[PDB]
Amino acid sequence: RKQLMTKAARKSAPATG
Amino acid sequence: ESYLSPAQSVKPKINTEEKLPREKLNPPTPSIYLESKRDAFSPVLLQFCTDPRNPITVIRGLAGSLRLNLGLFSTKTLVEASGEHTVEVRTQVQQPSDENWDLTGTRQIWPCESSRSHTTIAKYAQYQASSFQESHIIKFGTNIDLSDAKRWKPQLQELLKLPAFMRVTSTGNMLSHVGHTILGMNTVQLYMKVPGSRTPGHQENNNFCSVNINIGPGDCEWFAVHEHYWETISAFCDRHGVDYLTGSWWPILDDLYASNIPVYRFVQRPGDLVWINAGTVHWVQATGWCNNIAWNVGPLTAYQYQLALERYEWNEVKNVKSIVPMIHVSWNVARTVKISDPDLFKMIKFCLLQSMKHCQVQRESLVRAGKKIAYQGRVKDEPAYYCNECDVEVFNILFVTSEGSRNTYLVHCEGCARRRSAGLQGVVVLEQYRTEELAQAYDAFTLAPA
Numbered sequence: 001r002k003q004l005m006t007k008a009a010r011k012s013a014p015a016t017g
Numbered sequence: 018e019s020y021l022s023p024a025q026s027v028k029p030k031i032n033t034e035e036k037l038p039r040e041k042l043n044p045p046t047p048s049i050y051l052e053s054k055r056d057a058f059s060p061v062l063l064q065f066c067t068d069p070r071n072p073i074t075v076i077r078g079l080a081g082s083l084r085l086n087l088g089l090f091s092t093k094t095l096v097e098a099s100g101e102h103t104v105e106v107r108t109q110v111q112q113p114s115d116e117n118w119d120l121t122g123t124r125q126i127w128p129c130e131s132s133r134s135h136t137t138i139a140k141y142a143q144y145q146a147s148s149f150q151e152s153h154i155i156k157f158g159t160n161i162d163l164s165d166a167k168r169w170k171p172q173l174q175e176l177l178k179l180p181a182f183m184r185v186t187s188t189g190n191m192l193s194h195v196g197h198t199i200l201g202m203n204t205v206q207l208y209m210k211v212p213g214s215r216t217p218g219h220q221e222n223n224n225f226c227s228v229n230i231n232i233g234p235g236d237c238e239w240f241a242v243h244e245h246y247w248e249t250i251s252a253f254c255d256r257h258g259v260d261y262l263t264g265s266w267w268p269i270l271d272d273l274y275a276s277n278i279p280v281y282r283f284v285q286r287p288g289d290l291v292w293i294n295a296g297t298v299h300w301v302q303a304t305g306w307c308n309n310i311a312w313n314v315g316p317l318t319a320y321q322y323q324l325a326l327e328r329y330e331w332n333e334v335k336n337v338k339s340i341v342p343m344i345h346v347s348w349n350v351a352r353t354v355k356i357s358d359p360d361l362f363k364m365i366k367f368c369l370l371q372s373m374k375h376c377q378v379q380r381e382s383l384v385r386a387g388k389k390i391a392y393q394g395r396v397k398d399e400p401a402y403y404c405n406e407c408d409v410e411v412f413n414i415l416f417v418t419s420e421g422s423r424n425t426y427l428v429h430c431e432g433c434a435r436r437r438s439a440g441l442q443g444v445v446v447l448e449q450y451r452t453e454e455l456a457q458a459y460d461a462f463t464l465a466p467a
């Protein structure tokens with residue numbers, strides 16, 4: 001089969017810098 | 018084209034035009050005590066916590082009640098078990114929980130400085146213990162992933178003692194039907210804190226419920242507002258130049274009061290479990306030295322379903338990724354879970370009918386143009402797919418492209434694939450569900466008996 005790529009999903013707090 | 022029918026809404030009707038007296042602007046937080054495992058595992062507790070009129074609930078001494086060894090989450094035990102895996106930190110100004118000062122130190126503001134850096138568990142622990150010994154700016158270790166099943170086995174085994182609707186994994190949990198990992202939502206994250214450590218204002222990703230247990234020896238202070246008021250809070254955020262959905266803000270409490278918005282305020286002590294109901298806007302600050310653990314659950318109520326789909330479509334308006342793939346989830350739930358609530362049934366079935374339609378239309382147009390479609394069926398443990406360019410969920414019909422390597426493919430939605438090659442040349446088109454596969458799953462999905 002074809003290997004289909006995905007971005008990993010992750011909760012992360014907001015960041016300003 | 019919407020996956021929702023407004024006629025089906027179950028949101029509670031709330032005036033906001035009615036001016037509220039002071040005591041209704043500072044409502045008390047439902048605070049429950051569990052005398053027995055039996056009481057913890059009752060469906061009555063599930064009904065209470067997910068009631069749409071109940072935005073947030075604190076379950077006092079739950080840890081003791083079910084014989085959870087919270088000591089397995091002490092900073093000491095966690096360090097002994099950790100690897101050198103990188104974890105993330107936020108650096109913030111230490112200030113009282115009801116304050117957020119501008120750079121001058123003369124007024125309250127909404128934007129809240131919280132900058133990213135990295136460390137290890139062991140190195141944040143030394144900072145935390147040295148702070149506690151007194152040996153202004155502070156560091157907060159946040160979103161620490163306890164997803165490694167082997168490394169964290171004793172910790173994770175303790176959480177199997179919770180009632181099922183609170184557990185990380187459950188057949189009644191929508192997030193257990195994604196079929197892939199969403200770190201921090203259907204896996205556990207850890208929060209290592211010093212006093213002043215802040216998690217700023219938010220709704221959860223895709224408005225899912227949240228479970229949070231306070232470990233470490235100190236308390237946390239919580240602030241919450243009912244889902245109903247989120248657009249008004251979002252407008253203060255615009256007013257003050259900070260993004261509601263992805264930015265870092267801390268409400269000015271008197272703004273919300275002036276806006277006629279009730280604000281729940283309460284203290285979570287060691288062993289207290291906080292249940293955050295669907296769509297509740299909340300923010301949190303440590304009062305003492307402590308650790309918290311938290312994750313998301315998606316209980317099978319119509320209110321949860323509605324708010325998750327609404328936020329899914331609002332994300333798409335705002336060009337923000339929904340990290341919960343609600344179409345994929347919706348078909349999976351219909352395939353494997355009996356649904357007896359008529360409201361929730363109606364909404365899922367409406368969603369699936371719009372999705373079956375969308376797929377049929379676009380399959381039709383591809384055959385009309387002679388475009389090869391190949392079948393790459395679903396296989397156990399396969400993730401759900403999203404477009405590489407615009408981050409929308411791409412369900413079933415996939416537009417994939419190659420050559421990084423010639424053997425790996427990126428996924429796109431139709432719109433973005435056609436922008437890159439309007440004849441779809443060099444785009445391979447896959448389908449993971451045959452047309453009759455979807456027709457049969459939809460027909461098989463019928464309201465179960467109560």
Ligand SMILES: O=C(O)CCC(=O)C(=O)O
Pocket residue numbers: 208215216227228229293301309311312
């Ligand atoms: O412990 C915290 O800082 C809060 C994390 C959070 O917002 C949640 O548990 O939903």
Ligand SMILES: [Fe+3]
Pocket residue numbers: 219220221227293299
């Ligand atoms: Fe939260």
Ligand SMILES: [Zn+2]
Pocket residue numbers: 404405406407408409429430431432433434
């Ligand atoms: Zn796209």
